[PDB]
Every structure is written in C-alpha cells, then in structure tokens.
Amino acid sequence: LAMTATATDKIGRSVPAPGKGILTTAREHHGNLKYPSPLLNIEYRKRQLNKRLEQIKSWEETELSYLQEEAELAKEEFGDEFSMHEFLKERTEEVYRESKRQVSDAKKQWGNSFYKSDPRIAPLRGALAAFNLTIDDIGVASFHGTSTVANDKNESATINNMMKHLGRSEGNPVFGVFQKYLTGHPKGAAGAW
C-alpha cells in the first residue's frame, strides 16, 4: 500500500451527487520547471542517505566513548554499593536503540516519506517514487464503476485529470476494470472487493 487518501468535494446541496475532491492526490506546483527537482532522482537521495548513516555510526561509536567516563562521573556517586558492570550493559543497548531509531528516521526522510514537505512532488508522484517508480507504471485503475450516469464520467474525468497533471506519456492509458458488473455494488464493502 503505497498511497491512500480520502477527500471532501465542494459546497453543495446534493449529497448523493459525486464530485472531484480526490483530484488533489495529484496536486503539485508547476510554476517553474527551469530547474529539475534534485530530490526525485534516486541516486541523489542515496548519496544523501549514505552520508547520513555514516554520520550516525560515527555518532554511535563516539557516544560509547562518552559512556565510559560517564560511569564514574554519575553512577559511582549514586549508591554506596558498586554495581557498575550492569550499568554499561543497560546503556550500551540503550545507545543501540537510539542509534537504530535514527537509522529508521534517516531512511524515512530519504526513502519513504521524502516528499511530505515538497509541494513540487505530488502525493501520488512521490508515493510511487519511493520505489523508483514513475507515473507511467500505474497500469490498471479499478474504477468505482457503479453504473450510474453521474459516476462513470466523474470517475473517468478524475483519472483523466490526475494522469494529465502528473505527466503520463501521451498514449499510455490506464486500463479501467469495472468489477461491479459482476459483484454488484456492496455499498459499504465496495473498496475491499
């Protein structure tokens, strides 16, 4: 599951009538394409991620060095008994977690969710771009496809206008599959099928 979204459409007085509020899964800023964005390139983020993780394993091996003097500095003056062997066992593995959460935060900053503060990357452009995928690789769109006059042109115009905005190649349609001919509309259960 790369992407998920929900969206509320526009002011109206008709509740069963659909709208296009979900077209803003593809929202991005195209005012200035003179500079290609650096962050979409997969090898740019990899050399930004590598220079961060070696900054983390340097942070880890340095803080074990601080942990040696910190035993006699703050733990020998805590009790009348000297139990200083387990104190290093408690905090060497505590460094191991707080080094490990920094690895997972570095990878989520540069592989998983790098697009979350960039307006020039759509939510749906940047969800796929975590996997080095282009917009040209969404192949099928399982439409909602509920056999009404209003839905099947609104659903069709939404997929057309989000694939128009994200830069599909001209002549790469998505294949619309329309399961509700077969299973019917199970109104609550629709998106699971």
Partner: protein, 55 residues
Amino acid sequence: HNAITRNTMFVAKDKAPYSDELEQPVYLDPLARVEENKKKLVFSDKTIQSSQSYV
C-alpha cells in the same frame, strides 16, 4: 455580538471559494490559496501556478 442579536451566526455558504472553471487548477496546486476581494474570500486565476509562490 452582531450574530447573537440578529439571528445570523450560521452564514450558510452558497458559493465555494473556487469557481467551476477553477475547481480543478486549485486541486493540482499545493500552493494556490485564497485572496480577498469585495469583502469575500474567493480564489482567482493569478494565484494558480504562480511564479511568485515558490521563492
């Protein structure tokens, strides 16, 4: 004070901030936002895909 005396607290909106020609170019813009005119807060054309909102 104005609303509690004149029974107009809930001002039911009849128009959206976007126009029907501008509901979709707002949706594709992460930066296009509402300006004020005529004491109403509506969208405009010059705020959409602007060269001035990414500096």
